[model samples]
Target: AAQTNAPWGLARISSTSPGTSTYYYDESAGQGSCVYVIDTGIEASHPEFEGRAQMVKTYYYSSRDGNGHGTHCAGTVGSRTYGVAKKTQLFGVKVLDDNGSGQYSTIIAGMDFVASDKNNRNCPKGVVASLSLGGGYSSSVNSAAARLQSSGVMVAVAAGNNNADARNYSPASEPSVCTVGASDRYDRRSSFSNYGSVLDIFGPGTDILSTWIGGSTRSISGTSMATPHVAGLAAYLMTLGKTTAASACRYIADTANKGDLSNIPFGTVNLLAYNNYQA
Candidate 1:
């Protein structure tokens, strides 16, 4: 829940490679190409995200959650205009209320927007949709999330802040979705990290930097922070001719610290600490 890197900017976890930007800041994969930021809200005025995030859709599903959480995640995932993926676009979809809470019904409604693509104002389809939000398990799909995946939209969701098990969260644990779990800066699972067959991989989730509410700066850690790191790399993969979900994830697992399952011994593995980020 805290950052791993020193407070130069926002939060932390880890990874990186090289690219056209030359100064590629994330795992070798770098930023995502086009990812849907399905969260509470995207604060568009922050300096870190001057032109990175665009409002694809906004809704108030509950009355508890605020866009702040999403804003923090957005900052780490894709800064105002300079995150791991400066050229990528974040489609802001607000599914939580002003207080950081959403009902299963509202969550479903937000997912529906992503599935229909444009139902919530031209939200694109087949994009790498990143969601750092979730709740108790439910039998039905959150409208937008369910529809998008079924139609083959690439989905990357937070595997719950709980260290319990990946089996706990929906959408995240769903057979096809790529679920991200939190790992500290050392490439060790955060004490708070969750693990399971549902978890697809690990990423930086500590001391990361990004845009914040009203142009402020801060860092929040969890799988929420790690989810975007993967999203950014996915964006970069598209540039490298890796488009499908399987390939994108393959690149991550291959390039990450313990990307290969055989090296991990059937337990949790931390991608951030992998030396792949180094020369």
Candidate 2:
């Protein structure tokens, strides 16, 4: 099976410079790894998942993805066609509802579940949790994200879309988590992507093409889209022996393409996420 149009984000991360328009990756990229998408929910049955995505837990009344945000994030993380870690197992931990909103308690509960699942042998190998949702600062949620990281799960959270300092946001401001900002095809910081010293890295987020609900694809933008790219990259790093959260996070930061982004805010690191693939 050949992919006709690879997602620009995928192509962007694989090359040192922009405009390659091709995604180069290893055959064993995501072997024996798992990524937890903590968002609205995921359409596990979507063909893009290839039967690898599932709703393992949900705080909402139903596990079905009504908003489509979760499904899109899941696809970017490990869909057969649009994924960063093509072979990684995707588990959806739904916290947000149909309106794409949720309380901190619900989000924390999902993090707790992921920590429990990771320790209980549910995800025996490398485990990465992608949190593409956030609001104003919340100590409780920040603490929960820290606990998840302490449990050895790499936590990648969105810096946010406020176009302001990410330090004002929960989980993203938490130093223990990998805070991600959004970058465009030109390697410029997205206009709406929050930035600051809190951001651990940037990833392709503008006009990102990924799987959507009802077995279709859609192009969307946000730091939400960027976070999963780092999460998927973390999963792939785990397969390459960066087993612990700290190690994987370090690798992601150290190996990122440095000083190539334009319009980065003050204090924000000028590093963009890369999959160690050079074309």
Candidate 3:
């Protein structure tokens, strides 16, 4: 079966749209960056990965993705077409179970796993942790993210799909993570996206086509999908020598072109979603 697309998020982030003659962002492809996806798992053997991804830690199932959610997120984080940081060293930290749900403590454990110096030493690169799953708020999760931030690791999480203020969600409302909301291809807020002061940014999420299980592809929508775009971008910043979490956040917020989101009830500055280009 034919696999099927961001301006393809790489084009939106970088000038490289596969065939662009004026591509100027060719140097921003993730090189020394490392990303930890705290989700279901990742498709290690997917063609998009080309054996670049690693299942560093797993809480329940093996690092191999049983559910497709983590693989899709991983693809958006580092795949050649959908990703921003195309060469990032991806690490899958499976917290969610078969039904795409997991205990809050399990999520915390996943966070701790990547934050651990002993495990992170295996990569010895700046870390960017992305979580596309969320539930009720938990101080432990917040503390863990904060700890990782203190250690210079960038963290991004998704606002829930409940169509309400994201302040009620866990890591989204935690303030320590880059809380992302879903946006459509038209640069408008997604109908299912959670919005509020807690929402930090927006990314292409609706109808996003990316890698799936069995070496396939599919289109899905959620803040879950949006979170990885930002995570990948943050990791790309690290690859460019911006290792500090504050530095990556500042670069992202400063370089983001605004005025794309309209009629957003919340005060989002429309931190436009880009794939990998840091300029």
Candidate 4:
């Protein structure tokens, strides 16, 4: 059965028509895969997670999310209600602090943790990391993301909300990671989303509704919000056998809805993320 009335972001990805209002997805969703939310932290007990989300590692002292950003990102990645992959296991890797800020060292540590855990578990379904944070160019951070991908974690990072070329940002500028831009419900690129040849694809970001701290929900906007949608999609693709980082990235590009978006930057890819769910 299709989700006849679903979130605009969910409905948009499942159909080619810009006017689509329904979402159709595989029942299995992300059952066999897992996604790492590398951000501030997650409220693991949020009812939206339905017991599937957990705080696996944290560079911050406490496992709780003082800033609501991480929980929201986790919700978009695998919450039972708002996620693209409803069944994907969600692991929170808190690197940012209460103000949603982190240094390069802490971020790299979080990436290392994800890679190490993936190797130890030897997860057959594949692992994905959603990085919804970014800063100016940093060689160390870029290398860390590249190393994480080589370690078999599909990395989906935000193409920053700077409204400038994404090439100036680390991780997003890293060739090995899937850099995601933001799009609105009208199939138009969000005004603040960074763009350029570096962007692999776009995902719904403006006014996104997802889980928040205190067991609530909130609507927000950013390339931060966009990245998790792609991360969840990568997890779903992994469950469908695109299990490697390279394979999932290639599949995402190949199967994306192309040339339909409006106001995309001159050099940016016009591909919009899709789940291949035809209704």
In order, the Cα lDDT scores of the candidates are 0.59, 0.89, 0.74, 0.88
Model 1 TM-score on a 0 to 1 scale = 0.78
Clashes of 4: 0
Residue 102 of candidate 1: its Cα lDDT? 68
Write model 4 residue lDDT over 195-215, tens digit each, in one string: 999999899899888899999
Error of 1 at 171 (Å): 2.2
Which candidate, 3 or 4, has the higher TM-score?
A: 4
RMSD of each: 5.7, 1.6, 3.9, 1.2
Between prediction 1 and prediction 4, which has the larger TM-score? 4
TM-score against native, each model: 0.78, 0.96, 0.88, 0.97
The numbered model that scores best in TM-score is 4
Count clashing residue pairs per candidate. Answer: 47, 0, 3, 0
Off by over 4 Å in 4: none
Residue pairs in steric clash, candidate 4? none
Per-residue alpha-carbon lDDT of candidate 3 for residues 201-241, written as tens digits (9 for 90 to 100) = 77767776778878998889999988888888888777777
- TM-score order, best first, reads 4, 2, 3, 1
Tell me the deviation in Å of residue 91 in model 2.
0.4
